[PDB]
């Protein structure tokens, strides 16, 4: 599970 | 692409 | 800024 | 792809 | 709010 | 469970 | 401002 | 304790 | 450090 | 498991 | 600052 | 690490 700023 | 994986 | 769970 | 806003 | 499910 | 930004 | 976990 | 402080 | 579990 | 700020 | 997961 | 600057 992966939590990404974009 | 910048993440965490939790 | 957006942070996301991919 | 849901986010939060920080 | 300004929630994500994790 | 969420994570919320407050 | 905070990031809480419920 | 549910939170932190960003 | 502050941290939260998840 | 943990999310800490640093 | 930053956001680790541990 | 496992780590993003927010
Ligand atoms: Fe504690
Ligand atoms: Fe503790
Ligand atoms: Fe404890």
Request: proline share 0%; charged share 15%; net charge negative.
Given at each position: ?6 | ?6
């Amino acid at each position: 599970e992966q939590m990404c700023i974009t | 692409h910048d993440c965490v994986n939790i």
